[PDB]
Symmetry: D2
């Protein structure tokens, strides 16, 4: 079992990719700590995860036979993350693997992007990643082991219309990934990013995103973003890149960005 006797922390673990990552790590043998904000944002048009979503991930992780701990945590809140990390380090015996998956997407054109919306997207997606790295690194340093995977986007090395907040945060995540990779280099820690294309999760599959109306009605616009026919990839397709990077054998892969985007990267760098 590849990951037996490891422990993983996944932020935004209540649904979508975060649940996917937690469940696959659990199946391969890791104990799991998941957290999620479990509430809506006024500046986000689609519903975020709920308390029941989170319990369901816990139930799915436990079904594999692993230990799981969970908590309602806003990654913007550094003290809150640090407290939950302390619990996990003590309940599960140190955190080996951190996935900074918590994140939000918005659509709004410049100059009419609301400061509160900018704040939340930068805050959750970029500062929340910073807060998560900074929260797990001391334990990984003391243990001279870790694998941190950050989550950027296709949009983390490109750009589109009406995406200033989201794109700025996902570019900064890549910069952040490479710095953490420097600072933690000497302690047996790696830091890499996954950059997904369009993934079928409740971030993209909801009535607000459809509005800006069927799945069938929106597919062509999503498909234009990809080189390959596929309008949406499965969360599992990103999870297997995550698992490749957080393997112990990825000791000398650090500071990298791995795209899972159906050939969108074929168009660019």
């Amino acid at each position: 079992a590849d990951f037996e006797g490891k422990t993983a922390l996944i932020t935004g673990g209540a649904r979508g990719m975060g649940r996917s990552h937690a469940v696959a790590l659990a199946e391969a043998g890791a104990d799991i700590a998941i957290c999620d904000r479990c509430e809506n944002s006024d500046v986000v048009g689609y519903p975020l995860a709920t308390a029941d979503d989170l319990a369901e991930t816990v139930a799915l992780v436990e079904k594999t036979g692993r230990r799981c701990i969970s908590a309602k945590v806003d990654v913007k809140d550094r003290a809150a993350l640090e407290s939950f990390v302390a619990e996990a380090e003590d309940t599960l015996g140190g955190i080996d693997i951190a996935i900074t998956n918590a994140g939000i997407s918005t659509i709004a054109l410049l100059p009419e992007v609301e400061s509160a919306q900018w704040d939340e997207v930068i805050g959750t997606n970029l500062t929340g990643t910073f807060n998560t790295i900074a929260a797990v690194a001391p334990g990984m340093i003391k243990r001279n082991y870790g694998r941190i995977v950050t989550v950027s986007s296709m949009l983390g090395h490109s750009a589109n219309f009406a995406q200033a907040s989201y794109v700025s945060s996902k570019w900064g995540v890549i910069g952040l990934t490479k710095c953490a990779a420097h600072d933690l280099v000497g302690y047996g820690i790696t830091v890499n990013a996954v950059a997904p294309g369009n993934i079928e999760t409740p971030m993209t599959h909801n009535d607000f995103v459809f509005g800006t109306p069927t799945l069938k009605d929106v597919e062509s616009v999503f498909a234009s973003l990809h080189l390959q026919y596929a309008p949406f990839l499965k969360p599992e397709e990103v999870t297997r890149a995550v698992l490749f990077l957080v393997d112990e054998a990825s000791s000398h892969i650090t500071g990298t960005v791995l795209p899972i985007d159906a050939g969108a990267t074929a168009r660019m760098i």
Copy 2:
């Protein structure tokens, strides 16, 4: 060259912001400059003073141009917005904007203090967003703008102890390219300059010299290593000329780009 045009420069009190302002003034633009004019508790070197800002105003005026200034924190969107309105009432609509206000810090993860992260992200990235958001309505209305953001050599690389600064300068590029999309159909371009080591009070000060080793000569080797060519520091005017190239009316079809002025550091990378 720039006669009849009006340019907004943030962090206009000294350093590269002063150089940009004066060069645009000599070329014929009227200038609107703003600066924080105060220190920050999480930045180890002194920031500009009001006297620095008043100096840039006199330099711009010594060219024959008109100049207005204001004490402004670019983290404050509403402050920027009122200063834009202030500027246009006096000098006409803003045609050119340089998002130059910025700060640098040195701190290793995971001992990066949250207030310092907030400050750096806030000034460098959120401040750039606030400046663009401040100027764009009038550029859209007038159907003309040239916006230059300021990233860094570190905006497309990374180094030790620079998480806040590097994350911000990466952010600036993605923002630049985004602003280049939303603004595209209104005759507005948005490009970044990415300077290497530049001789300004950001780099030339005791705090930076102390932390990198204390005199100029003792820190030259450290700064030289970052460049491919031998020159430890470049003149701010070397960045300014890149700015002027990009904000030229003739640059209507250059948008979403990153122009490095980094003494060959970009020869080692993308």
Copy 3:
């Protein structure tokens, strides 16, 4: 922006961008050496320059007051270039500025790309650039001064369908640029690339490429490659970026790639 006392070499100087660069450098005070193969190629579907084309550019340069030398030279022939450089040392005082502009475009899908076509595109566009830098470098080292501008493309940092040969050569040119920037760094020489988008020249404005098929018929297809709604830019828009780079005051800009691509670069790195 004054080049009095300087001599500039422009390959593919017979028409299009080379001619644009040659005339503008001459206007700004530079003496000029221009060469072109002046001959069609069997693996390129549109016509290349004629000897009359080259004589026009000589005449256009001389009208500015400058001295000009010209020769029929295929840039794949290193010895021919070196011979033309030697004529430039003897007559014009040696080449201070070089623009490796000579190049060709082809269209063909893998796996049906003919080796003879791959060879000609890599030879002219990639090796031809190498041959030009190698030919002009020794004189620039001897005088401790040089400005070299190579010509890549929006496709030298992206990719598209049916363009393996072209795209590969233009990617290689960017690597070569950054290599030449290294080797020549100690000698007062800079090496930078321009990367144009769709430019109105005889490379794009011809029967073959348009393939009854008029300009107004192809405009929307060319426009889709740009972000701004301009299907083609003028050669002069590329030329002014070249002048910016080869200026004496650009001594500390080296190894860079300057896009002139109407916002294509806004979507990518």
Copy 4:
């Protein structure tokens, strides 16, 4: 599980190509491997021999798999096509291709001999082109392929005295993105691995150690470690071929169907400094 899959590996006589060949075999693939098996006039270290290639053949068949081999120069498209048809016939068609054949040289501009430029561009860039061209028709017919090209840390950076090598490796990445375009509709993916300093006979030889540490008449491994290690972020001057092999296996997996046109660095943090 690559059981029932056939992999072509060029440069399979030693180094990373042998590493790829043995791992794919162990994982269930049958193997077609080819190599030049002859030194080059313009490369300063020895290349592989026919006995090297035979060694790889023997090691693969020890795993229980079928293996075919040929002396092939990747610069010769017709020779690659002949070898591919022989593979198609004996082993049922090539599902996976790793374009590993390549060489490195050292020479400062403008003193780069044309003949060295031509060989490096020819083997590294054109030979990758040739390999892609040769295997793609079978992959198209069967509507399945996984192609991995081999660029380098230097395919997205530059250094002194490597114009030939660096131009070739940049070219490879562009070519990779175009093949990904051209072949996308036929169930074929094309990705690059970009290795850092790898312990193979390309780097571990008397010619290479002589360069970097010449002021030093008889340079040993230990005398060169520090200069190689300054190219990496992490301590290790050299990585194992198997560390690249493992990325190769990730990419050529059937499950990697929606990863195409990407460049995967295995470079011990070098990519942490850059893009």
